[PDB]
Write a protein that binds this ligand. Sequence first.
Ligand code: MET
Length: 523
Amino acid sequence: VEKVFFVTSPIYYVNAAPHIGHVYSTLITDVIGRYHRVKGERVFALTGTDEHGQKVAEAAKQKQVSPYDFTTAVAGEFKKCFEQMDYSIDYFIRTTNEQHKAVVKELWTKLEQKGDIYLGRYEGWYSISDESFLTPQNITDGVDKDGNPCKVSLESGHVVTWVSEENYMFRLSAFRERLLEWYHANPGCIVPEFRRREVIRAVEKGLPDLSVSRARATLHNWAIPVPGNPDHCVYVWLDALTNYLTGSRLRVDESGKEVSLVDDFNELERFPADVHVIGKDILKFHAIYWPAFLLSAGLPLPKKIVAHGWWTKDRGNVFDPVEKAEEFGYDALKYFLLRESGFSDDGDYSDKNMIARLNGELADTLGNLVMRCTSAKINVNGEWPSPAAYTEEDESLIQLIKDLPGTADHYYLIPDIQKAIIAVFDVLRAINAYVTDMAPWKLVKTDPERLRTVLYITLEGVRVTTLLLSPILPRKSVVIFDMLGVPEVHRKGIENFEFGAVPPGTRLGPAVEGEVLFSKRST
Ligand code: MET
């Protein structure tokens, strides 16, 4: 089934200015999207802001300004930030968008018509900061912004409060068995595996029905009214998850503004998401609530949910993304964030370690290799030479390069971006050691014919690795390709994953008096 490859980030609460967590989540979305574009697939990548709810309304209240003005302002900051981060996102959705609201109401009506919504009560704990319902097992003792004793969430340590309200309830309990059938029949649907196991365990234990409306006073009337009942507002999370369906149905102009909402998602061939990128803190909403709603409404389920080790949202200790990018570089910062962390919080995020990787991997491994195989001193004719016969050592390197695209492909599709970067750099380390071994600088004098072969393999190794790194180093890959003089046509497509796609005789790009890809940093 050829559809548009649909990849999403979460939509972020606009209670506060954007920070590194949002940038990280959206980066992963952007990288996956970029990889599928380089394979020559159709891609629609989605991000945005989650604008309704008690959390957000109370934050605007505390800034003494109207929700409308506050949300618009903060949304603007998210956009400026993401533009400044040089992503390639196809659309930025806001839950205040009038077309999104219509989609929420269509979905709600579908659920109601299906018989899965009834009027009941929620009497239990709620976390406003998480907009999450909690059972007594999931709270404990703590302190508020005062220092008075209170109950806090085990999930997140945020203050909880007791809620007793007549609410519309979704019959989530009825979806236990179907969700279980789904997890088992599609064992790649939640990544990484240990989070998939968490979800199954939780659903095995049983599911209560879920409150999908709240009394309007509680939400400071900042939410979507329930269809046919204006005394209730729709649960911010049902509203928010629906952004994925909304975005799948929006025709967007070349300026990035929405211009039209189609009736049927199949018209745009995006829905369901191929990959929802999320943080570990919002797994239940995406892997339990969302599929249950979709099953109720009769919509198709997502293919993969990937939950990274950071928190979607959190917190004298700062790490500004634009500030580190101006200091160290945008591509380098991105590389670091994707290289340092797997599916875990931990990871040395110090300046010390950022410099170690910049200098070690980007400068000494990658950049060193690019300069050497393009240098006037070694590549005396500034072209791709024609290879002479290959030794066994030559072929061992060629084999590594030939296998690399298959290996990196699989990693990108898990998706495990860290493992893909590590694969590419294993191959770059090999290319270096080959070059050390062959000493092509010595060959210019001694064996020009042997140099052709060595030089050709090196150039092609650098081209292939660079192509596979182009989703991670989008600007630098262009600079590298320009230096190698790679024609535009050979800068994407699975055709160009093959060894030898650029023919001998291709001319290198011009140089510049002083010119470094990644310049090293002091300590
Ligand atoms: C449908 S994704 C919603 C994510 C939520 N606004 C958060 O910041 O965690």
